[PDB]
Amino acid sequence: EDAKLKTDLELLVERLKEDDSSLYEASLNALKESIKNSTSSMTAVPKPLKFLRPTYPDLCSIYDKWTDPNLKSSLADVLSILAMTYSENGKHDSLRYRLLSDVSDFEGWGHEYIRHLALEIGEVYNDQVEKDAEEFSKEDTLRLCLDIVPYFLKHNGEEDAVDLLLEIESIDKLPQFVDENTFQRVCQYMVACVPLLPPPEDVAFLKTAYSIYLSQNELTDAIALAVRLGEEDMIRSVFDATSDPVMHKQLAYILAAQKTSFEYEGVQDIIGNGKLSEHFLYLAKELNLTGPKVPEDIYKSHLDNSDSAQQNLASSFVNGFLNLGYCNDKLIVDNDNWVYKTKGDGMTSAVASIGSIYQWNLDGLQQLDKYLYVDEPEVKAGALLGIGISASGVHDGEVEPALLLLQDYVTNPDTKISSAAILGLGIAFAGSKNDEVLGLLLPIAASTDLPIETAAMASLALAHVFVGTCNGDITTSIMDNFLERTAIELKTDWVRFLALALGILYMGQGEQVDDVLETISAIEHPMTSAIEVLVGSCAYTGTGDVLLIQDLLHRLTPEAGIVDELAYAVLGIALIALGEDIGKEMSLRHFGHLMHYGNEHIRRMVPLAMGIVSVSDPQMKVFDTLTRFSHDADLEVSMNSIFAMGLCGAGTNNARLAQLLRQLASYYSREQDALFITRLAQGLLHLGKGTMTMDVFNDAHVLNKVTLASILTTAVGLVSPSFMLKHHQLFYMLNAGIRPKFILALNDEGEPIKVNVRVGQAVETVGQAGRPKKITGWITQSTPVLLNHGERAELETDEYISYTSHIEGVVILKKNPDY
Amino acid sequence: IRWELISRLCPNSTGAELRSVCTEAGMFAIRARRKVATEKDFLKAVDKVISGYKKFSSTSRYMQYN
Amino acid sequence: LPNIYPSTRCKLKLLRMERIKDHLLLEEEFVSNSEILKPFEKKQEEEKKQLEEIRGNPLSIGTLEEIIDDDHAIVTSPTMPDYYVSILSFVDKELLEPGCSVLLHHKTMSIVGVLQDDADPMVSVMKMDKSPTESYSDIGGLESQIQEIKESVELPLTHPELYEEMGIKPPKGVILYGAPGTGKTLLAKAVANQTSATFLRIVGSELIQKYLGDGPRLCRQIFKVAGENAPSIVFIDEIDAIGTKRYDSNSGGEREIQRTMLELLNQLDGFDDRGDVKVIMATNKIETLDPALIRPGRIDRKILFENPDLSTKKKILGIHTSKMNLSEDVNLETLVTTKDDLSGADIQAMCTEAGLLALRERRMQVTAEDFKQAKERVMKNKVEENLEGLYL
Ligand SMILES: Nc1ncnc2c1ncn2[C@@H]1O[C@H](COP(=O)(O)OP(=O)(O)OP(=O)(O)O)[C@@H](O)[C@H]1O
Ligand SMILES: [Mg+2]
């Protein structure tokens, strides 16, 4: 009876205070088994547990006078159990109760008490952390952590185990307990820790997860975490963990999609992206997208109707964006007089469109070759710039033709030709960190005694070639270009691109530079503060640190240098928030509030702030405010809004946003600059007929540094859009960070094979247990499809086992004999 | 694809029925997961629409009124 | 505020709402600093005071009639002599649709706001506000019809990618013609269950009104309401009611019905080029329908419903008797799976009758005798058929 249980409690307490050793042991064991039975229903605060609250001081007093190590050891355990309802936080009762005795194998107790002691361990560990600034030792906590972690790992407490190892900050002991069935969920719950968890423990989490994956031979995710970390020797170790050549090819495909120049023999073709052109033409054949689309087909001006040079420039840009990679067009390839319709700088982009169409294809060099012989310097510059785009992101193992043809024209005295040469060098070798390109550009670049436009564009090329992991020589050269030049030149818009080039070098790491910030802080030029904040926030991109956002807003709250720093502020907050999608959604409201109370210089970027943050995913709540600000005053604001639409709708072929853009084309038709940028946004909207996007971060949250670099390159100076209206050659920078977006079920031999692919909205596997599905709203779609931003893939068929778990990009399959 | 053959095998059908034939031909490829609709698909679609949905036809009564 | 993942306790979850608070406090700090920097005498919340004092009180309610020479309008209050009210800057000049409800000032009578209707005195009944119940699992068999209705009405809304890539506009409308009591209404309930669109049901009887004018008026209102709340899955049911019956309350007679049907056949297709308004009609008598309605381009995929077969009958028995307090004596195999003709309505009717009979005896369990008695009860209460004698 329950009253009999209360009598049991009282009598057992009396026998515990009864000094007899036999009574000691009898009452101790009986109360142990009773509190074990008190946990029969571990809910509703059991009545025996409630009645144990007045007893706990009696057990404490009895223990104080107890001197029986063979019996007080278990009474310490009993006191630990009874310390649960004896909350009195800050007294750390049950933890020290679990000490002394060597019976700390508490597996016989319920989940509630173990969870409570884990929480108390976390609280007292925070108390120790503050105790180690301004009792249980650090090693003392391990005595119980090394028991709790196996307990959680056995009883599906993977999330709890990771949480405890994080709060104890001893995650390096995690791999000693990992089972072959436990690793996958632990890592899936653990790879998501990096973006939100405060540094520098993010690198520790990445390294620990990498160690878990390597021991389990699941290199599919491990290569992604290696790319996140950026340690080349780590990628090498991943490679040495594989003996099957097929896994080598698939890792090569993954890192080629990441555009990372890792050198490996016998694989160099795949990592060099040399098979991308054939894959894309196969995609065009399979999707019946071979038929080129006229820029008029994009405009559809015939349905909506009752300077020729600028409209021709817009049409050329649209055509270049449309037929990119398909190697066929009818507007420019067959019409040589078409180039002559464009005047001045328009001739350059005209020929550059051919290189854009022949992107990733070495075939285009023949077509671009003929326009090199034309004596007009603009035509030569356009063809020479298009040469790089025709081989952009493509690197054969031995001798790049683009480098050979490009190196001669860099030293040309013409500003336009040399500018096109350095721009093409940056485009072709973006993300490769090419050593020959290093040794060519580094003396060619910097050159503080050269035209500032050429120096700035060479610096942009340097930044595109070397992205992330920083570089001392490039930083020193850029700071040499920061020396003084002349006071008037420091006010020119070109120095903005130099600042961006300096910033790009550190964007990958974050919290790692920590030194150049002081060097920038040691210079008192008026523009120096803007460069400081731009670079500092650009380095932290992909993390989401909030204190930096507070600093940026404090900068925002209230002359050319002031305009530039206020300009870099919003770009910086956008880049920092461009991590977890929760920061994305908060940054939306941030930009809204800033647009509410903002000066006119900061007014014409909030659109761009939405665009870069929400690129390639046309979410409903993004473009409506953009449309609101499109009809607003400050024409530059409208141009920025429509370009933010273009970035937001990059490659998605969103008919709704296309209708909005056409309506804006009807409205902003009087101002020809607005019409030109509207047509550019139209061309970017349907980029590559929908088979290619500007997505900054892919599945598993890898960071395409080249794509972000291109977006920042096109958004840095467009606070004064007239500059890029004059120099539109930088609008081909999107072709550096551009990539296809598709699936391709490559056979083991290396040919595509049809297979059912399950496509639906992505869902995270964090709190769900068992084996929940990663796909919501599946479509049983066949071989190559176009998964938009926000969808994963998974093989419906039981057979055709994919070596890589993450089904995106190129995928190789094997025939599982089952079924 | 043989557009002449498809047009011939559809006598006395108003343009709305041709539009519906095009829509159903597009649909039948989707149900078979094929991303391209072929002639064999168009023939099935035109049979289903013109022949199957013939009792619910409007162009045979209203012609008399005209 | 965003959604929160995961459901259970997790340190990353705590980090997520920590980011939430960090960003929220940062917005609060930015707004505070911006306000403090602003000249309060014309900023902060003094704008509210100025708006209230200029607005005056009480704000009367009238009806707009024109927007001639913007900053000027001709309101028409029910009692006032239709003043030449001027339009103030506070009002949004985009919501001043001729026929709205403006807020005149009391004395000077200048528009200081537009009162949105937000009433929906009749549409609120129409607007589906809570999913009925049955999902697609409750429908036994009918797999082809479910597939067709899905690819016609659901896939265009939830998954437009297939259609835009394929390059075909989705099939506009679907008519569910078939024998009475065969799931033509259940399938509509199912498509209403899983939906991301408004579901305005209407029955063809309600279009047969009494007054001459309010025949096309109702249809115009229904389709306008469907258009504004895009997308819409309007479910005109018993569409044959307009043709037959010939109600005495109808003042026009046949001619008014003809005008109403003409307005319907226009609003379905229209010169107005309405957007995402899917139309799903269902009727027992497809024969007595003017072929203008059922013409392709207005409702494309005409799904046919047929009485269930023996396997479909047993599947319906299984799904309907799933929630049964069934004693083991009842055998589902020979229960109603007899091949002596049934329908999708009979199987549920006999279950309901047997449940009621078991309730009458207060027997919490269902007996095979009660099931047999309800079976024969449903059999007698059945108008058998007429056309079978031709082929008998
Ligand atoms: N295949 C089926 N699966 C499940 N229930 C069914 C099925 N066929 C019919 N029913 C049941 O039949 C009942 C009555 O039929 P229902 O109202 O759907 O027919 P209807 O032909 O659309 O109606 P009406 O002829 O009255 O306009 C429904 O409540 C439904 O539960
Ligand atoms: Mg019905």
From Swiss-Prot, chain A:
KW Zinc (keyword) present: no
UniProt keywords, alphabetically: Phosphoprotein, Proteasome, Repeat
Keyword Methyltransferase: no
More info: Present with 306000 molecules/cell in log phase SD medium.
Signal peptide: none
Gene Ontology MF terms in the entry: enzyme regulator activity; protein-macromolecule adaptor activity
Protein's recorded name: 26S proteasome regulatory subunit RPN1
UniProt function note: Acts as a regulatory subunit of the 26S proteasome which is involved in the ATP-dependent degradation of ubiquitinated proteins.
GO CC terms, sorted: cytoplasm; endoplasmic reticulum; nucleus; proteasome complex; proteasome regulatory particle, base subcomplex; proteasome storage granule
Family indicated by similarity: Belongs to the proteasome subunit S2 family.
Spans of repeat PC: 349-381, 382-419, 420-454, 455-495, 498-530, 608-639, 640-674
Gene Ontology BP annotations: proteasome-mediated ubiquitin-dependent protein catabolic process; regulation of protein catabolic process; ubiquitin-dependent protein catabolic process
Domain of life: Eukaryota
Swiss-Prot record, chain B:
Highest rank taxon of the organism: Eukaryota
Location of this chain's protein in the cell: Cytoplasm; Nucleus
The record's account of how the chain is modified after translation: The N-terminus is blocked.
Quaternary structure note: Interacts with UBR1 and CIC1.
Function, as annotated: The 26S proteasome is involved in the ATP-dependent degradation of ubiquitinated proteins. The regulatory (or ATPase) complex confers ATP dependency and substrate specificity to the 26S complex.
Anything else known: Present with 105 molecules/cell in log phase SD medium.
Family note: Belongs to the AAA ATPase family.
Descriptive protein name: 26S proteasome regulatory subunit 7 homolog
Naturally occurring in which organism (per UniProt): Saccharomyces cerevisiae (strain ATCC 204508 / S288c)
Residues of the full protein shown: 402 to 467 of 467
From Swiss-Prot, chain C:
Gene Ontology MF terms: ATP binding; ATP hydrolysis activity; proteasome-activating activity
Annotated phenotype, changing residue 184 to Q: 73% loss of ATPase activity
Keywords carried by this UniProt record: ATP-binding, Cytoplasm, Isopeptide bond, Lipoprotein, Myristate, Nucleotide-binding, Nucleus, Proteasome, Ubl conjugation
CC terms in the record's Gene Ontology section: cytoplasm; nucleus; proteasome complex; proteasome regulatory particle, base subcomplex
Superkingdom of origin organism: Eukaryota
Compartments where located: Cytoplasm; Nucleus
GO biological process per UniProt: nonfunctional rRNA decay; peptide catabolic process; positive regulation of protein catabolic process; proteasome regulatory particle assembly; proteasome-mediated ubiquitin-dependent protein catabolic process; protein-containing complex localization; ubiquitin-dependent protein catabolic process
Residues reported to bind ATP: 178-185
Numbered residues of crosslink Glycyl lysine isopeptide (Lys-Gly) (interchain with G-Cter in ubiquitin): 189, 210, 245
PANTHER family xrefs: 26S PROTEASOME REGULATORY SUBUNIT
Family: Belongs to the AAA ATPase family.
Role summary: The 26S proteasome is involved in the ATP-dependent degradation of ubiquitinated proteins. The regulatory (or ATPase) complex confers ATP dependency and substrate specificity to the 26S complex. Has ATPase activity.
Protein name per its UniProtKB record: 26S proteasome regulatory subunit 4 homolog
Gene that encodes the chain: RPT2
